[PDB]
């Protein structure tokens, strides 16, 4: 029942050309759905999921102009930050932005987001109150003030409580059979011959969606964090994710070792052992 939308904007300046590259990416429930890239031949927001092809030309023209506006905004900002941190010319710099809204299962606005980062580092953010700002760097205070004295917060607050919510609704409707899915985990275990009298047990979780998942190895006592080795959750490239966690076990003494897979689109945690 919980939903969300996010636009992750980025602008990078290189010693390169006279101008920044600006990329905007939109997500609904964590999946890319639109995209703008100033590097394209014909810079425009393009649909990124089939369900979006519904929006007529008016929609894409509008968003496109918004994009060009943002690009200008990032260009002036990149310029100012440069002065704020007294960085000279001939460097690379990044300015990033995340903004959007989160709705609970009842489709009501749970929280708005609007934070900026410079050089990968937090620069200024709009507090959940949608009224006050947080900015740690001494350099960021200049921006804080400017924005405070100019009512920026009211402006973003409005967007977050209004459009961000209202459109996400419209989007969620136009994509019910596409993004209402959870691809359940199909888990298995592999045996791997190790140091004499010790074998490695690998618990695999494949083709699940969304990415969030957890794996544990209960020697079935109740607990094992005993140098259990795993990997970050990864893209399979097909829309699903993969993961695995393993543990060193006495060859033979290895059925009393169970793996648990908690994933959401799953009735109950999955429970498995080894199986020829």
């Amino acid at each position: 029942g919980p939903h969300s939308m996010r636009y992750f904007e980025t602008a990078v300046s290189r010693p390169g050309l006279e101008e920044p590259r600006y990329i905007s990416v939109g997500y609904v429930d964590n999946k890319e759905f639109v995209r703008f890239d100033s590097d394209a031949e014909n810079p425009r927001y393009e649909p990124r999921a089939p369900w979006m092809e519904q929006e007529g030309p008016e929609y894409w023209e509008r968003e496109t102009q918004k994009a060009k506006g943002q690009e200008q905004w990032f260009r002036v900002s990149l310029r100012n930050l440069l002065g704020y941190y007294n960085q000279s010319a001939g460097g690379s710099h990044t300015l990033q932005q995340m903004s959007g809204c989160d709705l609970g299962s009842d489709w009501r606005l749970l929280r708005g987001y609007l934070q900026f980062a410079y050089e990968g580092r937090d620069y200024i953010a709009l507090n959940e109150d949608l009224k006050t700002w947080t900015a740690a760097d001494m350099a960021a205070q200049i921006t804080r003030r400017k924005w405070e004295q100019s009512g920026a917060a009211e402006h973003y607050k409005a967007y977050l409580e209004g459009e961000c919510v209202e459109w996400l609704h419209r989007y969620l409707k136009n994509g019910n059979a596409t993004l209402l899915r959870t691809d359940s985990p199909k888990a298995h275990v592999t045996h791997h011959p190790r140091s004499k009298g010790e074998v490695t047990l690998r618990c695999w979780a494949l083709g699940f969606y969304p990415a969030d998942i957890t794996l544990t190895w209960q020697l079935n006592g109740e607990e094992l964090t005993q140098d259990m080795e795993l990997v970050e959750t990864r893209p399979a490239g097909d829309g699903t994710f993969q993961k695995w966690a393993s543990v060193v076990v006495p060859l033979g003494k290895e059925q009393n070792y169970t793996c648990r897979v908690y994933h959401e689109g799953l009735p109950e945690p999955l429970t498995l052992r080894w199986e020829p």
């Binding site: 506006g69 002036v76 900002s77 704020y84 609007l114 400017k146 100019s150 459009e163 961000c164 459109w167």
Partner: peptide
């Protein structure tokens, strides 16, 4: 719908 910024930095 995309947000649109207010005051620049």
């Amino acid at each position: 719908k995309a947000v649109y910024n207010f005051a620049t930095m």
